[PDB]
C-alpha cells in the first residue's frame, strides 16, 4: 500500500518583535511524528508520537542542528524575497515549503517534492523529474535560473530518490502498531425536526481512513436538486476522520431520500436511509 514522508517548513517575519519564527514539522502519511519550533527556550527536534521515542539519541542532535541551519537559511530567503518583490521590512511575510517522498505499492520513489510558497502563493517548484523547475512569476524566475545554472536540484534529487525513501521504510516499521491502516466508515442517518413542517435528514460517516470519502444524497434514486449542507472531512484526533451531509425534506417523505457513502475501505458502495 502507498505511503509518504513529508516535512513542512514555515517561516514568518515579525519586525520590531525580533527575529522570524521558524517551524518544521514531519508527517508519516497524515500522522505527525516530529517537530522543531524556534519559539523556544533552547529549541530542539522533538518527537510527536510515543513511537519516535525509541530512535537513537544521535538522531535528535542531527535534526536539531540541521533545522537550526534551515531556520537560519529561511531568514535569508525572507530578506532576499524582500529585495525581489521590492517590498520592505516592518511588514510580515511568510515562507512555506513542502518537501518529501511519495511511495506506491513498492519501495521505490513514485513522486518527489520540493516547492516554496510566498505570501499565500506558489513561488518555485521542483518538477516531477526532479531536475527541472517551475516559477510562478518573474521574481521566482530569478531563482529558477540561479538553481538551473548551478545544478542545485542534484541535491534534492539525491535526497528524495535516496535517503528519503529509506527513512519512510524506517518510520513505517517503527510505527507499525499505531499508524492508521485503511479503515471503513461507519454510517448512520439522524433526523432533526427543523422549524416549519419539514424534518432535516443528516447523514454521517465516522471512523475512517484515509480522509478521501464521498457523501451524497439522492431523491428517488437520482441526483439531488434541492440543496445540502456539506462540511469538510475533519480529523477526529484518534487518526480517523468525520464527514456529514444533510438534505432537508418534507415530513412523511423521508423514505424517498437515501444517503450514499463511497470509500476505498468499503468493498461495495454504501446506501443508507432513515431507520
Amino acid at each position: 500500500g502507498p505511503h509518504s514522508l513529508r516535512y513542512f517548513h514555515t517561516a514568518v517575519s515579525r519586525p520590531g518583535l525580533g527575529k522570524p519564527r521558524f517551524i518544521s514539522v514531519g508527517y508519516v502519511d497524515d500522522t505527525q511524528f516530529v517537530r522543531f519550533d524556534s519559539d523556544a527556550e533552547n529549541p530542539r527536534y522533538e518527537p510527536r508520537v510515543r513511537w519516535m521515542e525509541q530512535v537513537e539519541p544521535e538522531y535528535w542532535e542531527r535534526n536539531t542542528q540541521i533545522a537550526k541551519g534551515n531556520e537560519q537559511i529561511f531568514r535569508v530567503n525572507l530578506r532576499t524575497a524582500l529585495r525581489y518583490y521590492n517590498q520592505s521590512a516592518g511588514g510580515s511575510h511568510t515562507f512555506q515549503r513542502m518537501y518529501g517522498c511519495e511511495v506506491g505499492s513498492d519501495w521505490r520513489l513514485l513522486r518527489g517534492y520540493e516547492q516554496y510558497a510566498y505570501d499565500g502563493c506558489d513561488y518555485i517548484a521542483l518538477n516531477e523529474d526532479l531536475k527541472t523547475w517551475t516559477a510562478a512569476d518573474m521574481a521566482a524566475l530569478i531563482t529558477k535560473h540561479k538553481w538551473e545554472q548551478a545544478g542545485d536540484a542534484e541535491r534534492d534529487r539525491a535526497y528524495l530518490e535516496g535517503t528519503c525513501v529509506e527513512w519512510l521504510r524506517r518510520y513505517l516499521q517503527l510505527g507499525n502498531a499505531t499508524l492508521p491502516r485503511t479503515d471503513s466508515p461507519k454510517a448512520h442517518v439522524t433526523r432533526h425536526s427543523r422549524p416549519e413542517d419539514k424534518v432535516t435528514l443528516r447523514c454521517w460517516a465516522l471512523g475512517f481512513y484515509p480522509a478521501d470519502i464521498t457523501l451524497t444524497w439522492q431523491l428517488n434514486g437520482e441526483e439531488l436538486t434541492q440543496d445540502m449542507e456539506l462540511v469538510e472531512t475533519r480529523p477526529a484526533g484518534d487518526g480517523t476522520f468525520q464527514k456529514w451531509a444533510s438534505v432537508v425534506v418534507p415530513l412523511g417523505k423521508e423514505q424517498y431520500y437515501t444517503c450514499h457513502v463511497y470509500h476505498q475501505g468499503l468493498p461495495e458502495p454504501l446506501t443508507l436511509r432513515w431507520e
Partner: peptide, 9 residues
C-alpha cells in the same frame, strides 16, 4: 531525517 538546504532563493 531531514537534510540541510544547499540552495537559497
Amino acid at each position: 531525517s531531514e537534510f540541510l538546504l544547499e540552495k537559497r532563493i
